[PDB]
Write a protein that binds this ligand. Structure first.
Ligand SMILES: Cc1cc(S(=O)(=O)N(Cc2cccc(N)c2)[C@H](C)C(=O)NO)ccc1F
Ligand SMILES: [Zn+2]
Length: 489
């Protein structure tokens, strides 16, 4: 019933559609099609000293910028890297972001009061989101929820950028990597929508690397609204249980079918909160910690929810396997002493309180794979993203732990000043000598060099550990000496 199904859903919402004020209609158009910044407005605002710098900058080169950002900055220039130009780019990237309601909701996971954007824009988002919420008052009904499926095509990179890089067979792009497919689906049991899903009443062909084809069954009380050309907008904050994930073929090309069922969001948050208790009990006992120490935090709000939860077990297992238990215990106890956390999340790190409470300047806020914040003594690990030159999340976690080791070691040396051990005169000299002998990112500064060397020294690939010894022998010696010192103290 291709056209029949469309007509009757449209009929169901016909009064709702007619009663929409233009203000409301503009809100829904703004939501589907975000407002891009005007390239000519941005350029007019610049001073040519900055424009001179902006020309000198190789846009396609940076690891700081997204693909979307790169294209806009490449398109705009038609009219390593210094400390000043990065400072410039930190501020500039704030002024080139589209007004994107659904992106704001996904980035914050619904926590829209998070101080990760300017107060005026934050309030504008808050207002539009509350107004959209009020528009979506009419549920789909018990007549329709059962007769209908709704469809959504998705890029795998929105769920996991790490697995997304390898999902499609490189030899033959008509095929899905079976091994990668398995990793993707293995722990995919539930999903959370914190923004407004825009779904198709009838399934569409998959365009532009959208290999994920969702088939979604609505709940009777699922609030929605009809959109032009056979689409529906769904309420935010709904839950989805994954019923089946299969490789399917459409037009001689392999895609992934994801069958999901709408459930209440409260139902899934319960699972996440129980899992948080389960993983803390496992690791409090394993770490010799008080029974009710809350060290591990799940900050989960988006569409790859269950995987963030499940991967946290695997990440911490790898962490335990590759690092001396005594080191792990001493450093973690130091973090617990400062109310630190292991935060596993699928919202952007600027929206994590462990960072933003200590970083008020938005241009100084960081989003990335992982982060260590000394002020809160916390490790933050962002699931959906792909770290630069990282294989996986585990290697990413160990690098951050290296920062914590750097932190704790500096504290032990001077309990009054509590600086990083990488700020010591001794290590700065070592960085000056061996700074360029390891990873490209390790060249950045003393802290990064230490964390990168630490990560490589505890890699599952023992060829990597021996490489540090051979290429950066003094760094290797220094870190091993820091580890001894931490453990013996
Ligand atoms: C290599 C590596 C990188 C990263 S990262 O998340 O991409 N990362 C580095 C990075 C480099 C370039 C662009 C971004 N936006 C982030 C952050 C800032 C970091 O150094 N955390 O301590 C984490 C762990 C790692 F091992
Ligand atoms: Zn780092």
């Amino acid at each position: 019933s291709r056209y029949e199904k469309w007509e009757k859903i449209k009929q169901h919402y016909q009064h709702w559609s007619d009663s929409l004020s233009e203000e409301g209609r503009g809100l829904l158009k703004k939501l589907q099609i975000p407002i891009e910044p005007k390239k000519d407005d941005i350029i007019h605002s610049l001073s040519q000293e900055e424009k001179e710098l902006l020309k000198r900058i190789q846009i396609d080169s940076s690891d700081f910028l997204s693909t979307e950002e790169k294209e806009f900055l490449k398109k705009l220039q038609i009219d390593p890297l210094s400390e000043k130009e990065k400072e410039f780019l930190k501020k500039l990237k704030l002024d080139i972001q589209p007004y994107d309601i659904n992106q704001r909701l996904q980035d914050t996971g619904g926590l829209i009061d998070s101080p990760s954007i300017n107060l005026d824009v934050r309030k504008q988002y808050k207002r539009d989101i509350q107004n959209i919420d009020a528009l979506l008052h009419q549920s789909i009904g018990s007549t329709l929820y059962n007769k209908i499926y709704l469809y959504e095509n998705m890029n795998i990179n929105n769920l996991t950028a790490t697995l997304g890089a390898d999902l499609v067979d490189s030899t033959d792009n008509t095929k899905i990597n079976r091994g990668i497919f398995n990793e993707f689906k293995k722990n995919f049991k539930y999903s959370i929508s914190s923004n407004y899903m825009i779904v198709d009443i009838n399934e569409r062909p998959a365009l532009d690397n959208e290999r994920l084809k969702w088939r979604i069954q609505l709940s009777p009380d699922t609030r929605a609204g009809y959109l032009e050309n056979g689409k529906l907008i769904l309420q935010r904050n709904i839950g989805l249980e994954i019923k089946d994930v299969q490789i399917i073929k459409q037009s001689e090309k392999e895609y992934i079918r994801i069958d999901a069922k709408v459930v209440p969001k409260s139902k899934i948050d319960t699972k996440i909160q129980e899992a948080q208790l389960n993983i803390n009990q496992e690791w409090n006992k394993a770490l010799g910690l008080p029974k009710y120490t809350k060290l591990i935090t799940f900050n989960v709000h988006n569409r790859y929810a269950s995987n963030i939860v499940e991967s946290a077990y695997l990440i911490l297992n790898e962490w335990k396997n590759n690092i001396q238990s005594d080191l792990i215990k001493k450093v973690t106890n130091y973090l617990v002493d400062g109310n630190g956390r292991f935060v596993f999340t699928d919202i952007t790190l600027p929206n994590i309180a462990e960072q933003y409470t200590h970083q008020d300047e938005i241009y100084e806020q960081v989003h990335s794979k992982g982060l260590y914040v000394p002020e809160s003594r916390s490790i933050l690990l962002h699931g959906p993203s792909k770290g630069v030159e990282l294989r996986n999340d585990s290697e990413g976690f160990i690098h951050e732990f290296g920062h914590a080791v750097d932190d704790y070691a500096g504290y032990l040396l001077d309990k009054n000043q509590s600086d990083l051990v990488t700020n010591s005169k001794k290590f700065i000299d070592i960085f000056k000598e061996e700074g360029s002998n390891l990873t490209s990112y390790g060249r950045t500064n003393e802290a990064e060099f230490f964390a990168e060397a630490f990560r490589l020294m505890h890699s599952t690939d023992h060829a990597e550990r021996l490489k540090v010894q051979k290429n950066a022998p003094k760094t290797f010696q220094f870190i091993n000496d820091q580890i001894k010192f931490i453990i013996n103290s």
